[PDB]
């Protein structure tokens, strides 16, 4: 197979509306934010403007091909793929996607989508101008898929290594935990990754 | 049926342009706002910038499937579904939808659409910096379907999802049904009126 | 016919690019602005930010159906319909449409399209902080159709100029008047019709 | 032919991607700017925000029809037509098109496209608050077609270049001239033709 | 062939999603920024707003035609062409494309795409009001194609295109090739680093 054949096959048999669950197990989605910049912090309103690479990985076996005299990977427009419906619960602006909207698909059906996003958050900015700094928590999970359909897990120094040396701010620490929440309305559990960004004015 | 079959059937047959009225009775739409944030208040201009989850539910029987050895629910792009044409009558900006535009469809044809929306309103901001606070009324109803085609009802903690990091806090939320007749048009339009009583912390 | 049949027929035979002229008479378009809010006034730059409902009506006989044991009216996306190419000549921003882009179509082929629009205008803001107030004139007509293809008229008005106006605006409406104009430009030998809407308003108290 | 037939024929055959060159001569495009407003001037940054009608005319014979029992002209969405790839070389914002994106096509294949545009420019703002005023030059030509493929000329008439200017602007127009230029860069051998529009304007007393 | 035939052939056989690799060698992409204006500089936040022409060239042999009694070149909408997925790694806004989105295609399959772009960057603004000026580095490369799929290479007067009406003037522009390798993955991503040495005028 050449690139042209693989991309034709993916475009023609692309079910972008269909979550690729295997045998009623959840799709395991990995999410890791790599922080690039902190722009416009406001300690009065508790709002921050962040630029991050949102490293997103999952398996879609319907994309797989035999790699034996073929590329191992191709670049695919995300309009031709199912992508997880991730939202940041404490975002107060739409994600501004700064990069071309292409994912990498590996011959085994692994997808890597890593957009550069600028987005504004409501989070704790208190202490930003002190030595111990502020801790801004960003929560990301599926908007519509519960834990039996999508599971989200952090993956793990690249979370801070590629931060802009020209920001007014610096990163002290980044920690990630998984949360699984059931609300009173609804019997299902929703997973999110909580990313704690500890940063301060340089 | 698997998810792929159900989503193929919905995409091929859903008629997004067609209100799913049963026997010329109105489609009963439920609307409830969960307030998430209050971002910018201006007592001089009487304008507020709010973030809310707009919990919207209705039945569309044309979506229904037999759930025996099948999923009970699927996620569907709203471009593949009829959605009620709700507008906030006192909005002074377009709704900024912060979340993926997917609804949940249950095998019986119940649809749940809950976008997170940031929007600016013209409403009463007077008293925001006092103990009893301001009361901002938001009115949401069908832009083009009168009461014989769409009925809107509120659903049966006001701050359980509200950001602890807002400069503002919620004292009270009430959501009641109204019916409006304009000079233009002889029919009545139903709306839910949401009274947000809030103040500076 | 049910709603599904009517909407299928309209979607399948929709010529949105085709002005529905009858026997080489102009399409008669009614336009009336209902003011909802005045948001930002600048007396230095002579600029206003306004929110209005643009009540627009016309006939398209190709949409008509027999209403016997059928709905009298349906809601149709404007992407499935011809809509008049109206522009406000003194707008300095694109119209921000706040509402779902649906019109009402009556079984006789009457169309009613009433979007809520936020838009900025260049107009006379002088006197806004006086008792007699400012008079901001907004001119709306067809961008490309002359008087033999589109005629614009004011609608009927049977209410208060401020029946829908926000009680929370910094401004109040004293009066709204609408006149028809027919204008010939240097470019073009034909006459273009417009409605001129005079918004007389002032700062409150 | 009726409007529906003409618009169907144009949509099916117009080739919007194909420059309508006749016998390997350049397509003659006329450009004239009609100034409507000057909104924001900054003498420190040398930036202006202008509203203009960009009157654009050319011939496309592939659009022509026999007018003998037929309309002489139709309104056509520009998505169904080849349009020249005009850019203002000194623009520092995307053109904000304020008007419906329709051109007028005459039965002989003449096209008139006149969008109302708000756009920001880098130009000489020095002297804006003096009696003789500033002279801001705006340069408009093909982004990708050199002089053997597109020729750009001012229109023969510029009588009306200020006729439509807002009386409510903080600025007033002293003079407009529109003249033909060529740009060549040293790298690359082809000349690109442009219209240079010299807007002599000042702050009002 | 006339223009109509060439453009019909390109539109009908356009694989815009398919990188035109020849015999599994990388597509050689040339990038040169021609600076037109510097509009807003902030020495506190280290942010600049720039207007540049992004001169981009590559070969796509699937576009080639016999130029005997035919045009040497045509203008093609970029929606009908594969274009490299270039991103500026230190951009903090989406590229605002000011110009019609047409490329020039030569009969041998060379493509020239030169959009005018306004974009905001995080870079070193220190010294902008001094004689030696600031040096703002912009890094541009493929978002998803590593060095075996896309190579980026730099290509007269640094201020031949620059606005005489800017508050700023250009002292020097240099363009150099860089390579990044991330810890996860053995593949290198190439970029062009464009060093813009500029200052506030007298
Ligand atoms: F997480 C990072 F930043 F280390 C990482 C890992 C793997 N690939 C990356 N990129 C970012 C630039 N474009 C594609 C390669 C980046
Ligand atoms: C649903 O499907 C099951 C199993 O195939 C069947 O027993 C049942 O009768 C079905 N119900 C309806 C109403 O179709």
Numbering used by the authors:
A (entry chain E): 20 to 175, 178 to 223
B (entry chain A): 20 to 175, 179 to 223
C (entry chain B), D (entry chain C): 20 to 224
E (entry chain D): 20 to 174, 178 to 224
Sentences from the paper on this structure:
Importantly, AChBPs can bind nAChR-specific ligands and induce similar conformational changes as in the membrane bound receptors. LGICs are activated by ligands binding at subunit interfaces of their extracellular domains, thereby inducing conformational changes that affect the structure of a central pore and its ability to transport ions through the membrane. Additional density was found in all structures at the interface between the subunits in the orthosteric agonist and antagonist binding site, next to loop C in which the respective ligands could be modelled.
In total, five structures of Ls-AChBP in complex with a ligand were successfully solved. The unit cell was comprised of two or four pentamers of Ls-AChBP in the presence of FL1613, FL1856, FL1888, FL3044, VUF24234 and VUF6105. However, the number of binding sites in which additional electron density was observed varied. The electron density in the binding site region was generally poor, indicating that compounds may have had several binding modes in the site. A computational alignment and superimposition of AChBP taken from the protein–ligand complexes and the apo structure showed that there were no large global conformational changes in any of the structures upon ligand binding. However, there were small changes in the loop C region of the crystal structures of Ls-AChBP. When comparing the protomers in complex with a ligand we observed that loop C moves differently upon binding of different compounds. Notably, binding of FL1888, VUF24234 and VUF6105 results in a movement of the loop closer to the compound, while binding of FL1856, FL3044, FL1613 and FL1909 does not have the same effect. The plot indicates that binding of nicotine, FL1613, FL1909, FL1856 and FL3044 do not result in any significant conformational changes in this region, while binding of FL1888, VUF24234 and VUF6105 do.
